[PDB]
Design a protein around this ligand. Structure first.
Ligand SMILES: CC[C@H](C)[C@H]1O[C@]2(CC[C@@H]1C)C[C@@H]1C[C@@H](C/C=C(\C)[C@@H](O[C@H]3C[C@H](OC)[C@@H](O[C@H]4C[C@H](OC)[C@@H](O)[C@H](C)O4)[C@H](C)O3)[C@@H](C)/C=C/C=C3\CO[C@@H]4[C@H](O)C(C)=C[C@@H](C(=O)O1)[C@]34O)O2
Ligand SMILES: CCCCCCCCCCCCO[C@@H]1O[C@H](CO)[C@@H](O[C@H]2O[C@H](CO)[C@@H](O)[C@H](O)[C@H]2O)[C@H](O)[C@H]1O
Ligand SMILES: *[C@@H]1O[C@H](CO)[C@@H](O)[C@H](O)[C@H]1NC(C)=O
Ligand SMILES: CCCCCCCCCCC
Ligand SMILES: CCCCCCCC
Ligand SMILES: [Cl-]
Lengths: 79, 87
């Protein structure tokens, strides 16, 4: 929608960096689902509780990282 | 070139196009500019996102074969989105 009201240019816009990043955070979420679900059905309880650990870490790491991103992003382009 | 963002004026030429018509032979000049389409846009709005879409369809190979709903949802959504983007 946004990119439709713009002329094709030859450079990377600040809008592109922000769309591309949020895109990644969601892509990695999917990746996480796969990783978690894959090592989860593994017979050994060794991997099973690792699967649990990944979620716990993600529940915090993702927000934190996204917050860090915002800080870097806005300081770079809000100037 | 600054008022022409979408293309890149790479080359120009100056030629003659004199032609013989039914009313006579008319002298004619022809100037020619060569426009090269900027790629940055299509990289970001077409290629990148499609790879990103195809790559997503692969992360279903890592879901257990028992949970097929997850696989279909991925494969189908990415396929539909692929259509939209192309449209
Ligand atoms: C990286 C592709 C894979 C598939 C990844 O895609 C995703 C996630 C999954 C994969 C890992 C999703 C993707 C973004 C990327 C992450 C990309 C960035 C954060 C930025 O770009 C990177 C790479 C880029 O170089 C490819 C690089 O520019 C360099 C090299 C270039 O030349 C090789 C050159 O031209 C340039 C001048 O300098 C840049 C500095 O940094 C960010 C710019 C990307 C934005 C992407 C998009 C913004 O809107 C687009 C579209 O409206 C849409 C629907 C999908 C988006 C997308 O496709 O989102 C989109 O196309 O990750
Ligand atoms: C803010 C709200 C977060 O909510 C909280 O998240 C953490 C993990 O991220 C959960 O804690 C999680 O990890 C621990 C690790 O020993 C498990 O015992 C627990 O089963 C699991 O749920 C808490 O049960 C939940 O209360
Ligand atoms: C521009 O440059 C190349 C090399 O000189 C030539 O082949 C081409 O025909 C030129 N294009 C125009 C439109 O003049
Ligand atoms: C020890 C685990 C604590 C997890 C906290 C997650 C908070 C996420 C908030 C997202 C807005
Ligand atoms: C600029 C891209 C940041 C992506 C972070 C993804 C963390 C899961
Ligand atoms: Cl749906």
């Amino acid at each position: 929608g946004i990119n439709s009201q713009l002329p094709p240019v030859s450079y990377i816009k600040a809008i592109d960096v922000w769309i591309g990043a949020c895109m990644t955070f969601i892509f990695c979420a999917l990746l996480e689902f796969a990783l978690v679900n894959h090592i989860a059905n593994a017979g050994t309880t060794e991997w099973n509780d690792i699967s649990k650990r990944v979620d716990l870490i993600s529940r915090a790491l993702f927000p934190v990282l996204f917050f860090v991103f915002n800080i870097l992003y806005w300081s770079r382009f809000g100037h | 070139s600054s008022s022409l963002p979408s293309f890149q004026l790479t080359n120009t030429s100056t030629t003659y196009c004199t032609s013989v018509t039914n009313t006579g032979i008319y002298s004619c000049l022809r100037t020619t500019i060569q426009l090269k389409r900027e790629f940055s846009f299509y990289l970001l709005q077409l290629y990148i996102p499609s790879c990103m879409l195809v790559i997503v369809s692969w992360v279903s190979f890592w879901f257990d074969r028992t949970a097929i709903p997850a696989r279909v949802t991925l494969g189908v959504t990415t396929l539909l989105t692929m259509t939209a983007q192309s449209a």
